[PDB]
Amino acid sequence: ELFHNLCTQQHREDYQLVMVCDGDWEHCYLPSAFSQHKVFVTPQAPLEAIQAYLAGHYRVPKQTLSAAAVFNDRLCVGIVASERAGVGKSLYVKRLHDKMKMQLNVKNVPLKTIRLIDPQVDESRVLGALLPFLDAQYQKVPVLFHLDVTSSVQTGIWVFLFKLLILQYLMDINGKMWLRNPCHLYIVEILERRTVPQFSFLDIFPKVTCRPPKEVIDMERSDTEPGMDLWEFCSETFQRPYQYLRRFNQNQDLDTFQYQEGSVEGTPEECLQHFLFHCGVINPSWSELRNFARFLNYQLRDCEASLFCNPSFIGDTLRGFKKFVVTFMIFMARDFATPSLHPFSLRKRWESEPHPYVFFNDDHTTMTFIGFHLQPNINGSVDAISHLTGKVIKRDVMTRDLYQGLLLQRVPFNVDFDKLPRHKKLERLCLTLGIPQATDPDKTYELTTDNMLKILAIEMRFRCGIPVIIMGETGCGKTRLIKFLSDLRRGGTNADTIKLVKVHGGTTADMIYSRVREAENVAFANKDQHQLDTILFFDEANTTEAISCIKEVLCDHMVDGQPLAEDSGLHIIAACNPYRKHSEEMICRLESAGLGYRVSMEETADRLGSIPLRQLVYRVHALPPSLIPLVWDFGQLSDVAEKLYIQQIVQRLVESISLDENGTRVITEVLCASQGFMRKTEDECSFVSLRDVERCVKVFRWFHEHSAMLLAQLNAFLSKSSERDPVLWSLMLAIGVCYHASLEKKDSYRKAIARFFPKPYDDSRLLLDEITRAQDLFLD
Ligand SMILES: Nc1ncnc2c1ncn2[C@@H]1O[C@H](COP(=O)(O)OP(=O)(O)OP(=O)(O)O)[C@@H](O)[C@H]1O
Ligand SMILES: [Mg+2]
């Protein structure tokens, strides 16, 4: 309407106007109105021409003091891209900032970092973050803007980059406006979202492609295809493992070798070759390789500080100790470095692999051996065997001379932590962790070898600096283990050494940032007062898209672009729920419930790509690909452990209400049978946890409390239509509420459960009868 009206009025009679539409949607209003005007010579340019055009426009003149000076050829815009995660995009921007601080002679060169976490790009948040810089001091001073477009972003990215980088502008509801100044550099950190034409939109831009180690060796210098950073290669993390490995592979004697601080040897290429050979991953990222290096460095450092490697002090009975240490630790790293996950490419199990751990205790005089035993063979060599089955885990980890020597040193080989007493377990565990006192915080937490190994894994990751991301079902033991460890390290002190955040779909980035900053203050306080490390724990973190913020906290070690303060003692753990899909029968039952769903699986926008989330047992969003190599399974809750927790709950009830042992037995057996049946019945129940047993016990307790009145009213009601144990009766009604009602195959459940009930109540019919009578009484 307005176009036609203006054309009727005194206007530009040579106006140049263009409209552009998506052919699939072209049937709509504005393309329809001008269909006659449809232009059939669609303008196009080859990618190289657009590249040269934008590169010319981005090029900052030499006279202009610009952050661009560091970038390729004074381009005030750059894209840093990777086909996968953790290959040096943020590192590249860091080094760019540093080089800018070196070159530009400026007292301060601001870095602004912006995280785009929302699936649909929020340009108003970007504008809000940039507006502080509208001040004039910045208009003639270099500033670097780093915009990280996390994996969480799915839509709005190309439009946003077009407007900001090309149109040089952003604008909001109120009317305040951002102008992209050429004196400032813009770098976009993005993962190449390859799925679409012969060229990706990002290619139009000055791009840096950061490459992984294997691509760095194979393909290779340039600033648009960086290799191994020299500060990292010259860092202790790479150099100690590199020097040790360099000697190891050549079969040199390490009996004398000791890494001298600040030393640097070899070349980036040889270091990468050795790391990739031993790493265990075929095409690792740089993060996986640093985690490998960081682990091997920490443990080799502790070995160097130990007495078994001190100036001899033991003669030569320990010849080959460092050779053994390097071999074993390269094997041990397999658990910490290697991924455990391989639309639903995200799954594996904990019991699938051994966890042979060796630790150097903070006393620098003892070692801890867990998860494996040493067995001598006829060939004079010593092998690593599974402590459970005795099967060989790794052959020739050491020679028999070193085994006998280490025995003479009282090193605790072949220890069976499952047969040890409680306090001996606590002593070994605390010594390994570096705790002086075996202050047992929970006698019901069973310190089995597996749980101790889990604790020690979390500990090593805390020590070296590998992020801790654990995957497990609800009630598999994560929160109790973390609590146990926090309490053990606390040692009775009155301190808040652990903060637990229960993450939900509504957990926003600002909530995570605030929680982390609060935990950081709390940790500074705790370390000052009590000298205790602090844990922050995110449970159900994948449940939110703000999980990308959690990635920043775990991997990037930052908070909304601001860095985390080391010297805090704050450790972060994240627990992610698993990625499972409901069975097809179960999805049928769900789609058939009532009038069915309001939206079909096709029309949904709530999905994990191909999968609607309602078809997932857990509403979980996709993991940032950087966290994928780090997630390790906590393990499934064993039948023995389930029964033990049920027994603990029923006994807690016994003390609360003074039941007998017969009722305890029956309640335990019926709760176990109920959980078993619901687990087997994958067509009606996909989710089973101990929270359901707590709920059923709560209901049982409620029925037991009221049982006097309910049984009186029941006898009266039934007399109107002219004996019972309160415990078995309340159990039956609790079972009714928790399991029997939601079910469709109620009869099979009652048949299974009845067998555990004492006579004469061991009948499915009596069970249904009592449930019916109680329902009637409640209607009456
Ligand atoms: N030469 C190297 N190149 C890249 N990363 C390296 C190198 N040497 C060590 N690293 C480690 O790899 C990690 C790379 O993290 P970085 O912030 O670059 O990841 P990223 O490129 O942001 O990936 P994503 O955005 O997917 O997390 C750093 O923590 C760094 O310590
Ligand atoms: Mg990054």
Neighbouring C-beta atoms of residue 381, cutoff 10 Å:
14
| Residues ≥6 apart with Cβ < 8 Å to 327 | 248, 397, 398
**Last residue before each break in the chain (C–N > 2.5 Å):** 195, 220, 342, 722
Exposure b/e, 624-660, CB count within 10 A at least 16 = b: bebbbbbbbbbbebeeebbeebbbebbeebeeeeebe
- The residue whose CA is least distant from atom 20 of ligand 1 is 86
90 annotated ligand binder: yes
| Strands (DSSP E) found in 626-760 | 632-633
540 annotated ligand binder: no
Q: How far is Cα 251 from Cα 663, in angstroms, rounded to an integer?
A: 67
Cα 86 to middle of ligand 1, angstroms: 4
| Residues ≥6 apart with Cβ < 8 Å to 537 | 479, 482, 498, 499, 500, 501, 572, 573, 574, 575
Q: Ligand 1 atom closest to Cα of 624?
A: 26
Cα 545 to middle of ligand 1, angstroms: 22
- Is the Cβ–Cβ distance between 466 and 292 less than 8 Å? no
- Is the Cβ–Cβ distance between 80 and 187 less than 8 Å? yes
Cα 89 to middle of ligand 2, angstroms: 6
Q: Which ligand is nearest to the CA of 237?
A: 1
Q: Which ligand is nearest to the CA of 238?
A: 1
What does this entry list as its resolution, in Å?
Answer: 3.3
Best of 90, 152, 223, 623 for a ligand 1 pocket test (most atoms within 8 Å of beta carbon) = 90
- Is the Cβ–Cβ distance between 81 and 191 less than 8 Å? yes
Q: At what angle do helices 449-464 and 286-305 cross, to 10 degrees?
A: 100
Q: Ligand 1 atom closest to Cα of 625?
A: 26
88 annotated ligand binder: yes
Say which experimental method was used: cryo-EM
- Is the Cβ–Cβ distance between 679 and 638 less than 8 Å? no
Residue 775 backbone class (left: φ over 0; alpha: ψ -120 to 50; beta: rest): alpha
Collapsed DSSP state (helix, strand, coil) of residue 685: coil
Tokens of 655: 């003390």
Q: How far is Cα 184 from Cα 75, in angstroms, rounded to an integer?
A: 10
Q: How far is Cα 150 from Cα 277, in angstroms, rounded to an integer?
A: 31
Neighbouring C-beta atoms of residue 387, cutoff 10 Å:
22
Cα 779 to middle of ligand 1, angstroms: 65
Q: Which ligand is nearest to the CA of 284?
A: 1
Cα 70 to middle of ligand 1, angstroms: 20
Closest CA to 643 of 695, 693, 697: 693
Q: Ligand 1 atom closest to Cα of 91?
A: 18
Best of 187, 214, 287, 551 for a ligand 1 pocket test (most atoms within 8 Å of beta carbon) = 287
Residue 652, amino acid: R
Q: How far is Cα 442 from Cα 434, in angstroms, rounded to an integer?
A: 19
Closest CA to 439 of 495, 487, 391, 392: 487
Cα 626 to middle of ligand 1, angstroms: 10
* Residue that has been written with the tokens 């995957």 in this structure: 471
Collapsed DSSP state (helix, strand, coil) of residue 395: strand
- The residue whose CA is least distant from atom 8 of ligand 1 is 232
Exposure b/e, 331-365, CB count within 10 A at least 16 = b: bbbbbbbbebbeeeebeeebeeebbbbbbbbeeee
Cα 314 to middle of ligand 1, angstroms: 42
Q: Which ligand is nearest to the CA of 87?
A: 1
Q: Ligand 1 atom closest to Cα of 228?
A: 1
Q: CA angle at residue 675 from 673 to 677, to 5 degrees?
A: 65
Tokens of 625: 């690909």
- The residue whose CA is least distant from atom 21 of ligand 1 is 89
3-state SS, 735-780, equals HHHHHHCCCCCHHHHHHHHHCCCCCCCCCHHHHHHHHHHHHHHHHC
- Is the Cβ–Cβ distance between 383 and 374 less than 8 Å? yes
Closest CA to 466 of 676, 295, 283: 295
Best of 91, 193, 564 for a ligand 1 pocket test (most atoms within 8 Å of beta carbon) = 91
- The residues that bridge with 207 in the sheet, in sequence order, are 79
Cα 136 to middle of ligand 2, angstroms: 30
**Pairing state of beta strands 498-502 and 534-539?**
parallel
Q: Which ligand is nearest to the CA of 86?
A: 1
Cα 151 to middle of ligand 2, angstroms: 11
- The residue whose CA is least distant from atom 3 of ligand 1 is 88
Q: Ligand 1 atom closest to Cα of 287?
A: 12
Closest CA to 249 of 338, 326, 334, 336: 326
- Which one-letter DSSP state was computed for residue 501? E
- The residue whose CA is least distant from atom 29 of ligand 1 is 287
| Strands (DSSP E) found in 503-634 | 534-539, 558-559, 562-563, 570-576, 607-608, 611-612, 632-633
- The residue whose CA is least distant from atom 30 of ligand 1 is 287
Residue 654, amino acid: V
Q: How far is Cα 660 from Cα 651, in angstroms, rounded to an integer?
A: 10
Collapsed DSSP state (helix, strand, coil) of residue 181: coil
Tokens of 49: 């021409």
Residue 171 CB burial class (10 angstroms; 0-12, 13-18, ≥19):
middle
Q: How far is Cα 325 from Cα 333, in angstroms, rounded to an integer?
A: 12
Q: Which ligand is nearest to the CA of 146?
A: 2
Q: How far is CA 334 from CA 319, 636, 778, in A?
A: 25, 21, 60
240 annotated ligand binder: no
Q: Ligand 1 atom closest to Cα of 151?
A: 26
- Which one-letter DSSP state was computed for residue 283? S
- Which one-letter DSSP state was computed for residue 555? I
Best of 80, 225, 286 for a ligand 1 pocket test (most atoms within 8 Å of beta carbon) = 286
Collapsed DSSP state (helix, strand, coil) of residue 199: coil
- Is the Cβ–Cβ distance between 488 and 433 less than 8 Å? yes
Q: How far is Cα 626 from Cα 621, in angstroms, rounded to an integer?
A: 14
- Is the Cβ–Cβ distance between 242 and 256 less than 8 Å? no
Helix (H) or strand (E) holding 392: strand 392-399
553 annotated ligand binder: no
Residues near ligand 1 (Cβ within 6 A): 82, 85-91, 189, 191, 210, 228-229, 232, 286-287, 290, 555-556, 626
- The residues that bridge with 144 in the sheet, in sequence order, are 111, 185
Closest CA to 347 of 549, 539, 547, 576: 576
Helix (H) or strand (E) holding 498: strand 498-502
Please report the DSSP string for 294-316 in residue order: HHHHHHHHHHHHSSSSSSSSSTT
- Which one-letter DSSP state was computed for residue 166? I
- Is the Cβ–Cβ distance between 773 and 736 less than 8 Å? no
Tokens of 179: 């102008």
Collapsed DSSP state (helix, strand, coil) of residue 103: helix
How long a stretch of residues is the chain? 780
Bond preceding residue 197 cis, omega within 30 of 0: no
Q: How far is CA 509 from CA 154, 414, 649, in A?
A: 17, 48, 37
- The residues that bridge with 499 in the sheet, in sequence order, are 536
- The residue whose CA is least distant from atom 17 of ligand 1 is 90
Please report the DSSP string for 364-380 in residue order: SS-EEEES-EEEE-TTS
The alpha carbon of residue 716 and the mean position of all alpha carbons in its chain are separated, in whole angstroms, by 58
Q: Ligand 1 atom closest to Cα of 229?
A: 1
Residue 645, amino acid: Y
